[PDB]
Subunit: 445 residues, 4 copies
């Protein structure tokens, strides 16, 4: 069987590029899919009551046709992201609608409109084949992927590709995602695998790490500098588990927000010291459905100042959205920045503009990362400066359960998924660098 | 009488600096004031039902003691600003609340905590006296004032003085404003009077012109460049009457929003062609008290694209606030900027964050201007590149009516006020430059 | 004959996309070429004694194979650039070296490694065919080109493509340039043709205009704002002319430097008023081959201040290099910027660093433009805000003489070349916009 | 004796603000001075043969009159800076030329135009008296002083005070410097003393730490971010000993250049790993005295790449000037920044502009720091994130020897000077924080 021979060559460690080019491609591959017919199955239920285990299937699907500028990748491991969860509960809309509408553009785009949607927006693995015009990547190259799919035909993205008007999120607005044994990506999504990490660890930072890097570190986001005070909501989640690391590695002070003493201890394990538990404080920023309580804004602001010696934060790392956003704007220092990439609790934000203009603050929208920012974020991982935050790993066959844990907030850092990898622990080729950092690497386990 | 002697010297033309130094200072001056006792006379009434004529008094007040780094200015003219309106209807709080609590600091700021409040945040006039440490300005100098009052003892303002924690607005959070025959200002508020303008014209740009300059032109605001498309709310109001000029003079395209065809004609007189009447289009961005209508946002966005050839705006010049802010965020181009210095219609903003993060937009809060920005804005006026926008002039005794007109929105550009100047038309000393630009200078009359 | 039928289709004005798709591609096309065998013919000669008429041949060459993301363009007109002239004298090295070495990379790059090299880095024309993966452009589209050729496989260019490490300049480091009846370009080189211009006018701004735009207008260069004073060396040259237009269109003040009273008249024709004749002033910035004369820097600075009312320039637009650079650093305002894209007089620059650090100045290097900047620069042409500067037009068969003209600086404006266009004056489809700007369009004739 | 009673009050540790206010001011104070007579004395000699011990005098000088916004400070300790060395060798120009022509401005600045010059640009001590208009600082306050003297009457400095046209360096371009028992400073030079440091340690970072902070960390300089590679010339000198710390604490990689293995060991003690010894490597960047050797530039570049895994530096921290500047421009990464605040080896820089424009690099001039940058730099010291780098301390009477050591390169630290402090080791009031950082605090000893 051809898939087993691909895995055997990977595990062998001796296969050269010519060997991979010679290996026969399988005729099908195992993939975690949504089914088009079942897209209304959660109709009328509440969001908590929607169960990804009901809609996620394990299918054998044919290999898509390789186009120019693309690579076929044998996937050793992937991860669950929030966008995967939303996809699995057909929220906010069935991902199938875009796939069909986009597919009518050209024959190449049409490959993605199918009765099934292969999900997954992270990958770690090995290049099998490359389409026409590809020089920078060869069969056998060990890779991770970022999830930005840009065509770059418009000039708009040529000073920062996040401005491309035709940007899709791989595995979400494209098919052939990474929760599968094989994946199709553009070669400009490919990055060198950090050699000191396992397959599942290498696959875990991708989406959240690059997002946090752009949002906090890069000049396209908050432009952090050493000495800054930074409020980090959700500091032990996927995004926060990288944002906290960037604040500390950058010489800044994180004020970490968590919802349980258990999460607080992980932040201390990361090296943070100023930690706020939103439950124990019992913040109620909203009096009712339509009115906020500035007394509760001010109470958050006083709690921050206890940790900073009377200083207000230079940057708020936002993502919870409507519930917290009025407080985020209020507590930010004169001249400071609220940077936002999400609105988990609701996207209709309300805030008092007097604080924004009279104190010269700014709200900066950020989304994923361009290839240079993705490369820089992955490079900091490769250098041992930023660490994966895996808490639990599931086999591909159990992806539905992994999605539900994330949906219900059962875990802390990243939830990983094995794909072709037969067990955890494989893929390390820099044991010296790994052993220097193993304690941090395992801090979320 | 010593006030007449001061005016006669100014009107004369050959008074040297020594002559002004030798003039006797009056023991009192006429000023437009609020009265501490009356500070709640409008409590219980509705916003449109407070008439500033009820709360604005013409009193004779003693001269304050001159301090270090300050100047006593004989005021030839001033203007009404919206903050003057807000002051006169003791809304949102009595300006006395500030004055009172501050004066407890230093005996110098204590001079401002009085039972009356001399209003006014613009001036054009002549320096009479300077306090200790004043080298750049001398008696007899023709000046306009910007309204930034900064102490600059804190380090915070030394990379942009707007960030000074003690940054106040002169005549609003300080006493001895410009709607009076004399005023007290810091000498770092002083700028050279544009020689081609009359006293009342020279006093009209100060507050709104410098604010629009920082908001739209400077790198501390939207950083406009030629080719940009800029949506300008209230394009024929105080702020808009300068923002439109900066867009056109900078090589950009303003899309001007007004509420009457009469105001549309002024915008065409300024050189603009893309004009939207919000009354005629009947935008109703809010369905009910708590929900907006995204179909109305899209309708604005389509109308803009009719003027731009399918392009979305790079910058939104905001200030109306809650009524328009959701639409402003929606219509902005991917990567664009919404810049806001106010919220006339309500400061509790609501917007859909999905548009802000998924299209990488930013909301930038802006407030007045630092001295360098104020100087640059006044310099463009002095060079004839930006023109005053006076529509109507009142005598000092009629300031109450001037404020009512702005309160109810009877006027268009700036409403000016004569102080010591006995009639309009005085104070020009560069007649050739004035003749070059008079048609534009008079565009709002 | 197939080439004639392509031209007939273009001149007809009613050919639809499907019509172009069905046209027969010729077997050969006529092209201006260098010959590998002759690359040593000028060895031993001074630069000004090398004659491009001796090295430039008119050949019939076969059509290259169309690759992914590429377009075959029927070229109506092109222009002579400085890089074309240098290539024609095999300076600084022969262009064949790069074509050979680069051709070793892959079969696609090998297409360019030929015994002949078709030169030309500007184009205006009509798309004939597009390779695999192209949806933005289609047969029949009227285009101009920018000359940046980037693969974008490296992440480096994904936040500003000028940072791409393996960039080529089309027609200089690639084959199939624009001085020919057909050309091969990447589709990410294509821009919409300005409809109000003729073929030869539309082909003229490209390289020099986008370069000046990035250098002066964009935030990657000097970030011009209205009110700035800008010193522009060679203000009537190819580059200095577009810089002068950008200064004026953005509301800044150019201080134009020229070498003759007739060149001063060109600057006045462009709308500039502050003009300095370095020949009349007799500046000798260098006392000998190794020592500069600071008293001559000072003389330039005083003369500048005569035009600005005592103000030093915010920006120096540099390109002459060693001769002028010390003076450019000297005269720049405290906090100002010297932006440089060339060193025509010599690339070993000498300056007094005391002025740079003690007055907090910066020198910013700039080079060509990314696709977004090229689009914005061409869009300002399409809007009628920036105008082509054609001074003389040659037919394709006379390209050798056009190159000599540029080599000996016989013209102040761009030198254009007709390719397929049978005469000047064709290709206008927005005659109303043309009429409005006709006098400016012809200012360099 | 009044001076002795001031020192006793400080050493007692229980003197209140009112006790300092009641202390009798001395009528003279001991100071390190230059003499305007001794003006010319080193002319005709070479730089190394200039002995500061001949030109630096220990005189008794009368107290200057205190002005508005100023403070008289009892100086416990100071430091030697390079500007002290340049002052003492009257080189390039005499500092008297500054002092002298200035004071003819205002009677307040005229106090500084004296026949002697009290040197010193750092201080740690205790406020004794404040002038009119001072609220933020009071007698008894423990302070360090930054050396920025700005008048701020001009608007130019109000968006970054370094742009004030009257910006000066206290103790170098002004009188009453800190190498003395008393000093006169503007209160906007005052910063809170770090409580965990001794007087001499607290005085040592001021000038070079704030300069390195602006140059490397702030957005007004290089804008460092974690992951950047930074080449740091003179990494164990004054400036470099802070620049190296900022690189490491901000998550970047310094490539440190020193001239002895002993200095290399200190860099390793600071936490750096990539270290280049310029003497051992034998770089000779200048062929003759008018020509450089690009083979030597390339050799440095390959040495850097050995440390970075083949990456070129994002930032070069320059200050040696002519000898190294050509290399610095060459080795910088494409799109990178060379930031320079000095030219120790000669201010006539020469560099190859081809590397700057073709690789889109920039040279950014930087000079000291504004009050906000100085506050942020001192705050990082106060938080124990940046440490002082004292190597040796001299008594006030031996300042000439201290100057000579820096002039010839005998030491590596900052070299500190006791003023009123009778011995080393006094002034710590936060011993717990000191203990946490003592090993790093003493790394240069
Ligand atoms: N490129 C983009 O634009 C990206 C967006 N995303 C995100 O997708 C989702 C994933 O974020 P991710 O970190 O991976 O998911 P996680 O669940 O792993 O972490 C999110 C954290 O947010 C906190 N949180 C949730 N709700 C609230 C609330 N109402 N108030 C305060 N805190 C709250 C929780 O931390 P705790 O309970 O401990 O307080 C939670 O753990 C987000 O919605 C965002 O859209 C992610 C990557 C990229
Ligand atoms: N932070 C700062 O430094 C400064 C703030 N301010 C301003 O005070 C307030 C007044 O500004 P100013 O220009 O002098 O006042 P004006 O009244 O002169 O102009 C404001 C314009 O806004 C328009 N407008 C008013 N209400 C609405 C609405 N509900 N929706 C849409 N448009 C509306 C009106 O134009 P039309 O009806 O024709 O559409 C009006 O002309 C500004 O909003 C801001 O607070 C001013 C200067 C500085
Ligand atoms: N980096 C890039 O992307 C680009 C660079 N270029 C440059 O093109 C060439 C120069 O630009 P371009 O304007 O098109 O060429 P032009 O010949 O059309 O103009 C050059 C101008 O330089 C002036 N000049 C030359 N030498 C001196 C001197 N010693 N002192 C003062 N002025 C001098 C002359 O002014 P005189 O007329 O005073 O009156 C001349 O007009 C270079 O080769 C360079 O490559 C061009 C396009 C792009
Ligand atoms: N603009 C501003 O505000 C400031 C400027 N300065 C600068 O001070 C001087 C440097 O400051 P500072 O750090 O206090 O002085 P230091 O003497 O303490 O350190 C300077 C370092 O530069 C190295 N160096 C000296 N000469 C050369 C050379 N020819 N080539 C390469 N490296 C060299 C030396 O290290 P090694 O021998 O180990 O290689 C030396 O340690 C500058 O001249 C200027 O005065 C300083 C502070 C502020």
């Amino acid at each position: 069987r051809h898939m087993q021979e691909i895995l055997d060559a990977i595990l062998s460690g001796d296969a050269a590029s010519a060997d991979y080019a010679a290996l026969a491609l399988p005729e099908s591959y195992r993939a975690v899919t949504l089914h088009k017919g079942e897209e209304r199955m959660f109709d009328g239920l509440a969001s908590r009551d929607k169960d990804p285990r009901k809609s996620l299937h394990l299918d054998d699907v044919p290999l898509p046709e390789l186009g120019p500028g693309e690579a076929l990748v044998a996937v050793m491991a992937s991860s669950v992201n929030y966008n995967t969860v939303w996809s699995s509960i057909f929220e906010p809309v069935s991902t199938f609608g875009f796939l069909e509408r986009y597919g009518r553009l050209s024959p190449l785009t049409a490959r993605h409109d199918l009765p099934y949607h292969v999900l997954g927006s992270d990958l770690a693995g090995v290049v099998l084949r490359t389409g026409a015009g590809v020089n920078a990547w060869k069969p056998g190259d060990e890779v991770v992927a970022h999830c930005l799919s840009v065509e770059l035909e418009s000039p708009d993205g040529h000073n920062d590709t996040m401005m491309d008007p035709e940007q899709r999120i791989w595995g979400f607005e494209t098919n052939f995602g990474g929760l599968a044994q094989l994946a199709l990506v553009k070669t400009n999504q490919l990055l060198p695998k950090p050699k000191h990490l396992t397959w599942e660890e290498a696959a875990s930072p991708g989406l959240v790490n690059s997002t946090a890097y752009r949002q906090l570190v890069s000049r396209n986001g908050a432009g952090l500098k050493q000495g800054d005070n930074v409020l980090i909501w959700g500091a032990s989640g996927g995004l926060g588990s990288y944002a906290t690391q960037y604040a500390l590695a950058g010489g800044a002070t994180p004020i970490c927000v968590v919802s349980s003493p258990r999460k607080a201890d992980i932040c201390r394990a990361m090296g943070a010291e100023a930690i706020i538990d939103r439950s124990a404080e019992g913040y109620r920023f909203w009096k009712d459905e339509h009115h906020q309580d500035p007394r509760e804004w001010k109470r958050l602001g006083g709690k921050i100042r206890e940790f900073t010696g009377g200083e207000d934060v230079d940057i708020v790392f936002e993502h919870p959205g409507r519930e917290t956003f009025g407080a985020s704007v209020y507590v930010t220092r004169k001249g400071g920045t609220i940077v936002t990439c999400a609105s988990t609790s609701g996207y209709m934000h309300q805030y008092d503009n007097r604080y924004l203009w009279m104190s010269l603050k700014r709200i900066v929208g950020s989304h994923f990362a361009n290839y240079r920012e993705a490369f820089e974020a992955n490079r900091l991982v490769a250098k041992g400066k930023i660490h994966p935050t895996l808490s639990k790993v599931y086999a591909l066959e159990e992806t539905g359960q992994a999605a539900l844990d994330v949906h219900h907030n059962k875990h802390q850092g990243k939830v990983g998924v094995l794909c072709l990898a037969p067990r955890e622990g494989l893929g390390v080729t820099d044991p010296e660098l790994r052993s220097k950092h193993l304690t941090k690497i395992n801090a979320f386990r």
